[PDB]
Amino acid sequence: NSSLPSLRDVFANDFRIGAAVNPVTIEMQKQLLIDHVNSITAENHMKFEHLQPEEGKFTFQEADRIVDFACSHRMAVRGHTLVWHNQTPDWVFQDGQGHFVSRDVLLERMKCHISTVVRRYKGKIYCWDVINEAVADEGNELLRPSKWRQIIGDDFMEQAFLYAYEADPDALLFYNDYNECFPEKREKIFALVKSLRDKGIPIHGIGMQAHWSLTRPSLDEIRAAIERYASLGVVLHITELDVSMFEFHDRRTDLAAPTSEMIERQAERYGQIFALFKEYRDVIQSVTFWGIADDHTWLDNFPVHGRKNWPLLFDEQHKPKPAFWRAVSV
Ligand SMILES: O[C@@H]1[C@@H](O)[C@H](O[C@@H]2CO[C@@H](O)[C@H](O)[C@H]2O)OC[C@H]1O
């Protein structure tokens, strides 16, 4: 690694390079982080359930540690995430009798959470994924069902962005989602963000999660999505990048290691993807991987629990994989 190029330096004039982490992985992958990234995202500790597990009970300890680490190494921090249909405690949507609260009550709770969380990190966190995955991933409906939407109404996103803006008007606010390059969903995301922007809502960027496979989405689909979203005038962040060795239909659990073909195709895939990102450097300002080395990845248990995946640029021994070389040589 002594003569290895540094990711953040290679892309210094293109975009920040980030990694998702937690207190445990910061320790385990500390040197890799210090040598390669200039942006950090909390993989789980800034989500609702990990910040306000019980009403009025805020547990900022883990998030504070992540922010302390980032700031001590001059790394930016992306806040993830405020309003999402997942990892949000049941108390949020219920009253004392266990019944769903009213629109006004949920809005009060949303505002309180957003205000308390955003104000705490104001000046340290430069952007926030305010709304996460509100768009439907299947069907003809624009929006996915969720208790937020059910109780408040479809304007729940407008409210979330306005509350976040009030808490920190200098932060860049994002709508973040996955399968962002499949045409049907891309158009829903485009339509949604355009509608918000057309109402003057403070949504500054779109976060493309990029939980991709070796084959999907195609390079043309990626290009088309970047251009489609960029046409809205918003900033673009690739937020949770990883390249799975398994396609959606591939639920095998026997592979103890990736084949030479999979490693090679992954190398080619990463080189093609980064070549495209660099081409669109004028609109893409940050590229964050959902981790940094294969010794830690949520893909080991999702969508198939108990297996192993090798989605990143460094292997389990924290050594550069073939994908690393193609990615940094674009
Ligand atoms: O540890 C796991 C996290 O890595 C996981 O993170 C989510 C991955 O899917 C994305 O669409 C989400 O934005 C991101 O937060 O969440 C589950 C947790 O168990």
Ligand code: NA
């Ligand atoms: Na850029």
